[PDB]
Ligand binder design. Structure first.
Ligand SMILES: CC(C)(COP(=O)(O)OP(=O)(O)OC[C@H]1O[C@@H](n2cnc3c(N)ncnc32)[C@H](O)[C@@H]1OP(=O)(O)O)[C@@H](O)C(=O)NCCC(=O)NCCS
Ligand SMILES: [Mg+2]
Ligand SMILES: [Mg+2]
Lengths: 225, 77
């Protein structure tokens, strides 16, 4: 398993943007052009190039050789390279990617105060109860943990939000480990939270427990190679 | 850009504008191209239930992420 991160301390220049556009498919280019907000374009762009860069290095291909598809729920894959399982998430200044020889999910979300209404309506009763147990001091932060942990799972599985959020329960324990309640039956999965930035909650979901201790940062320059 | 043509489209536009912090959304605008993402899709679905007592499955919003489609779904229910 490898986890790479890109921190957007500044916006992409026009040069960088145009150079990054060089690596991607015509379809992906038109998609980036259809974004109303530039930063959404940049996040999607960077994520695409991150996968191209990591997998091209690993298989000794050129970046632009990689051909993406998606399965029925929109999960991206590389049909030519089915052993190269990956997943991307982006929010705010972060673009992050996970890579493994088995299916993998990752999520990061910028925290913003928010009501518990989304948790009440969508999360499992157990999670809602856990959430209500936190002091007001901590409920936003715990909501974003739950959100990113659950999303790491549904992204690993590949169905995303077609999988009801109340069909499984996650818990972040005081020692820092995550537990998941699944009908197993279900194959093993493991969730790790990462603290990469105090304004953000991030988690990764993988088929095995061999996670890296920290993530590897990647610069724009490395990606422009 | 396509302006809303009925009360359900306009209301959904108001809901989307408020969730996304963007003004003047057309009814063919793709939710995910104009700032939408999963967390905000949940907020959209919560406010549709509050407004219309209609359960908006998330997979429906992702499958057809325009106000026109969503209005259709919401109206017929
Ligand atoms: C997957 C998921 C929850 C992402 O939500 P998000 O927080 O808005 O987006 P994130 O920043 O965390 O991740 C974005 C990336 O997730 C990846 N992704 C997209 N769909 C995915 C899926 N079903 N499973 C795993 N990963 C997915 C893509 O790499 C995407 O990057 P891009 O949009 O720049 O190309 C969300 O897109 C989802 O639920 N998708 C499924 C919708 C669905 O059910 N469709 C079926 C209709 S019948
Ligand atoms: Mg995102
Ligand atoms: Mg996400």
């Amino acid at each position: 398993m490898k986890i790479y991160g890109i921190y957007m301390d500044r916006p992409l220049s026009q040069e960088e943007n145009e150079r990054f556009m060089t690596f991607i498919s015509p379809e992906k280019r038109e998609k980036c052009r259809r974004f109303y907000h530039k930063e959404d374009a940049h996040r999607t762009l960077l994520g695409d190039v991150l996968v191209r860069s990591v997998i091209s290095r690993q298989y000794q291909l050129d970046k632009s050789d990689i051909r993406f598809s998606t399965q029925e729920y929109g999960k991206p894959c590389i049909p030519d390279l089915p052993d190269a399982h990956f997943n991307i998430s982006h929010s705010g200044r972060w673009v992050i990617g996970a890579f493994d020889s088995q299916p993998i999910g990752i999520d990061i979300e910028k925290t913003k105060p928010i009501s518990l209404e989304i948790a009440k309506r969508f999360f499992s009763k157990t999670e809602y109860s856990d959430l209500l147990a936190k002091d007001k001091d901590e409920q936003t932060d715990y909501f974003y943990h739950l959100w990113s942990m659950k999303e790491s799972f549904i992204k690993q599985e590949g169905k995303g939000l077609s999988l009801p959020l109340d069909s499984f329960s996650v818990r972040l324990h005081q020692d820092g480990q995550v537990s998941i309640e699944l009908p197993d039956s279900h194959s093993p999965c493991y969730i790790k939270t990462y603290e990469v930035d105090p304004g953000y909650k991030m988690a990764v979901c993988a088929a095995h427990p061999d996670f890296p201790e920290d993530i590897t940062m990647v610069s724009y320059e490395e990606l422009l190679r | 850009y396509v302006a809303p043509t009925n009360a359900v489209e306009s209301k959904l536009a108001e809901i989307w504008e408020r969730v996304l912090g963007v003004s003047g959304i057309g009814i063919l605008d793709n939710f995910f191209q104009i700032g939408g993402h999963a967390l905000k899709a949940m907020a959209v679905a919560a406010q549709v239930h509050r407004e219309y007592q209609v359960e908006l499955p998330l997979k429906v919003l992702f499958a057809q992420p325009t106000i026109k489609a969503l209005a259709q779904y919401v109206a017929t229910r």
